[PDB]
Design an enzyme around this catalytic site. Sequence first.
Site, PDB file in Angstrom:
ATOM      1  CG  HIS A  55      34.473  12.161  27.668  1.00 41.37           C
ATOM      2  ND1 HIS A  55      33.182  12.648  27.663  1.00 41.37           N
ATOM      3  CD2 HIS A  55      35.202  13.007  26.899  1.00 41.37           C
ATOM      4  CE1 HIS A  55      33.131  13.734  26.911  1.00 41.37           C
ATOM      5  NE2 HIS A  55      34.343  13.976  26.442  1.00 41.37           N
TER       6      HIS A  55
ATOM      7  CB  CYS B 118      29.503   8.273  31.488  1.00 39.58           C
ATOM      8  SG  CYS B 118      28.434   9.658  31.096  1.00 39.58           S
TER       9      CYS B 118
END
Lengths: 233, 224, 4, 4
Positions: free
Chosen positions: B89, B131
């Site tokens: 992430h 991301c």
Amino acid sequence: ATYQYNMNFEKLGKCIIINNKNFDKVTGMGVRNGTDKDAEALFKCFRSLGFDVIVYNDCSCAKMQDLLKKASEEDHTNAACFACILLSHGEENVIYGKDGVTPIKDLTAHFRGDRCKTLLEKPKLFFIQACRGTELDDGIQAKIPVEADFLFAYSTVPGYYSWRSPGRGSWFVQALCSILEEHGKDLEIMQILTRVNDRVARHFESQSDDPHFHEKKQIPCVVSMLTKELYFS
Amino acid sequence: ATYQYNMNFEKLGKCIIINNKNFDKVTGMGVRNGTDKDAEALFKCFRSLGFDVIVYNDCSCAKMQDLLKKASEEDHTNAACFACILLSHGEENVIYGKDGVTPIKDLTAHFRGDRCKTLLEKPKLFFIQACRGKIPVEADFLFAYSTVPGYYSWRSPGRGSWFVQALCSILEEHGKDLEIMQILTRVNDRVARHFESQSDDPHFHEKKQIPCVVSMLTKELYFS
Amino acid sequence: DEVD
Amino acid sequence: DEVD
Ligand SMILES: [Cl-]
Ligand SMILES: [Cl-]
């Protein structure tokens, strides 16, 4: 041909140069001696590639925005690509106009795939001579995404100064034009920009009577969202 | 050859893969289903190029920094380059370890020319799936990001991440023939064209992705 | 030399 | 699909 941008268009394209030399006193910024040499060099070296080059000198923030918005609203159907060169003072993420600062992203956004339909699937190239911070490099002994098909060629890496010799022009522009003149009709854009990176890295070192700014180095920074190879053939 | 990185070394180089799947509850982050498939794909495709690949799983932030710091302190005299792939992430300009976030710049700084002399003038490559919502010390880095700043990077639980699957496909096909920018450009096209998100939620439905290459390289890089 |  |  499947891996290259189609260049079979009437025009290579528009190249807009924003050459900001003189700044309102309120900005606290000094005259950018040497920038006219850059603008002259770029006019020549980009014209040699086939671009239709137009130069705008000492633009306000509103003028830069208007120029680029209007450019994005022209019909680029008969053009292979678009280029824009920004020459100014800068800080991270922004470029100075004569009267203030403008975020670079807001200038480039006009050419997004959903905002400039006639440049869809065509390369949109931005070359930026400006500082991006105040760090010095001391050196060491030797449908599609709306943001697709952009390339940003920055004169320096994020957070760092960018150098300009007053009687010669900026190091990045000097290198860029010399490589384009030598190889621009032969090599792919990333091959060209890689050679620009090396040239700036190896052929330049700062000279100053101010010790803090003497014997410093620079490396440019290429950010590519291109989806094909680009030749100026 | 004057325009390409010298590859005449005993080794192509080390490749560190950090595969972060499971996260501490405190982070509130979900399990990254599909990442094991990415990591296994990457192991194979980077090994095929000649990299000495090692995979580390579910690393804390401190472990990620230590791995990269220790790697930067190894002797790379007989290596042509160095690669690191991060799977996690991410947000801002940071990446998640199992226990929180750490700046990407801190991970890569260990390899600056003035801090890792045996990789001086050699390419240092970072591939990041996450991301994002005399010689200069910053030279010879390349960052291959799965997405441009401010956007999502997508992962299929059954197939893996779009970027990784595209990257490995292009590398196994063209990795021994093409220059790294030619490779990554094809990766940009593959991700942009051949993938589109599917979700019951419209905010995550029918979305597109474009990766982002940042090059400070000074030569052409061929894996031969 | 000067900076931008 | 999921995001990272
Ligand atoms: Cl001038
Ligand atoms: Cl998994």
